[PDB]
């Protein structure tokens, strides 16, 4: 309908939202996929409310309302990983989780109110460009954690991680949009696999297609402050 395939091509958007809200590949894109489906198989009604990715974010929260798969306050990372990976304004963020704009607000400000009290964690950098590498470090220790050690190749990586094993890896291979540097992401992904692995890319797209194993957080490529303080704060969640 072009329509339907607008919403088809939102898919890999909502990949890495839900990977992000469970901290795995396979789970994330399961309910992707599944909130596919059951919009296709719907047949037409509550369209046109909704602008095509929005309404895809929409019917993802109506299921997650339901089940998941405290500490931290509901509803809270949802709406700030909406604002810091999509961009999405209080607006369109009340829209999708069908909350008033200003309710979104309280969201986002309780998110980061909760970011300020987070326990320090330890965290290893690989990075090549050492302005890139300085920048983030210094990112990561405003906001409390520690960081082991900056690798400047994946061959370093295994050293550093052995002196202090961290709790979190970023990462950044400088990669393409190529179809090159795809072993060089499963190589990394399968060395720390029991650790969270956030990936820097300028291509997220093509991190983003259920096909091969992929990270579960990625960074944005030119980064924003913002964007990393919430890829590192929701990765070291899953950490232990």
Known sequence: QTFADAVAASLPHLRRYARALTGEQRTGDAIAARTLEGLIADPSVLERDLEPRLMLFRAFHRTW???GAARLTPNTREA???????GFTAQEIGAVMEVPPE????????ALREMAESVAGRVMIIEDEAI????IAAIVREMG???????????????LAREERPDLILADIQLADNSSGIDAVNEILAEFA??????????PERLLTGERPEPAF???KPY???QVRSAVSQAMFFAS
Request: glycine residues 2%; hydrophobic residues 50%; negative net charge.
């Open 103 to 110: 309710t979104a607000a309280d969201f986002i400000d309780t």
């Open 224 to 226: 924003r402050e913002e």
């Open 145 to 159: 954690h520690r960081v082991t050690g900056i690798a400047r190749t994946r061959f370093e990586a295994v050293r």
């Open 218 to 220: 990625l960074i944005t």
């Open 194 to 203: 029991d650790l969270p692995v956030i990936f820097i890319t300028a291509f």
């Open 80 to 86: 700030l990983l909406l604002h810091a990976i999509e």
């Open 65 to 67: 309302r339901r089940e």
């Open 132 to 135: 890139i590498a300085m920048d």
